[PDB]
Design a binder for these strands. Structure first.
Length: 158
RNA sequence: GGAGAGUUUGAUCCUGGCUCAGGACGAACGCUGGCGGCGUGCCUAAUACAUGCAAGUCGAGCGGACAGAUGGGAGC
């Protein structure tokens, strides 16, 4: 796959020793196809390349795919991780990616172009948005649900 | 049809307030100021008010004064 990477944040963190404060940088990087695949990234409290390496692993480990009915997700979903709570709500065409900051990064590199998204708790909350995008894959498009249920696609939808 | 951000720590996650970006107005005050077109202009003391003006009309209801003079009269 052909990944694009986006830098969410770089916070200087610190450990204290007898000498004083010893500083490292923890980078957080989203990576994705712009076509259904996107990765978390951690940054190993050191640099951005370290973040990219872990991001590109997490794209294929965690979000095996981001389900996409057209230019939007199949259904409305609430992604929760810890005190992360994202509402991801499917939009009409030409709506845009209406989302805040770290959430936008995920949904842009996932290739989602039309979505409404409210954050209900905030602090690099990509894990929560990741859990929802996986929760869509629990009931992606309609092929699985119909196959899971024992139905047709047009039977299920209408 | 729904975007967030800053700020508690040496650093952290959370809880939690605070602050900011938006829009609105019968606005006021600064400083500054060219014109035009629509709109708006006592929110305070239902306080007190100088002055003027804001409901008068019908003579085809009306007797009546006060006029009118078409003409005769009219001293000259």
């Amino acid at each position: 796959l052909e990944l694009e990477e986006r830098l969410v944040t770089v916070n200087r963190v610190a450990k204290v020793v007898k000498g004083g404060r010893r500083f490292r940088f923890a980078a957080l990087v989203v990576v994705g196809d712009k076509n259904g695949h996107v990765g978390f990234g951690t940054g190993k409290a050191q640099e951005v390349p370290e973040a990219i390496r872990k991001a590109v692993e997490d794209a294929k480990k965690n979000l095996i795919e981001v389900p996409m009915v057209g230019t939007t997700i199949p259904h409305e979903i609430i992604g929760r991780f810890g005190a992360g709570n994202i509402l991801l709500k499917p939009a009409s065409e030409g709506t845009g990616v209406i989302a805040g900051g770290p959430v936008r990064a995920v949904l842009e590199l996932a290739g989602v172009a039309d979505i409404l998204s409210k954050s209900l708790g905030s602090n690099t909350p990509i894990n929560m948005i990741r859990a929802t995008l996986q929760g869509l894959s629990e009931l992606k498009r309609a092929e699985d649900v119909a196959k899971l249920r024992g139905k047709s696609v047009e039977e299920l939808l209408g």
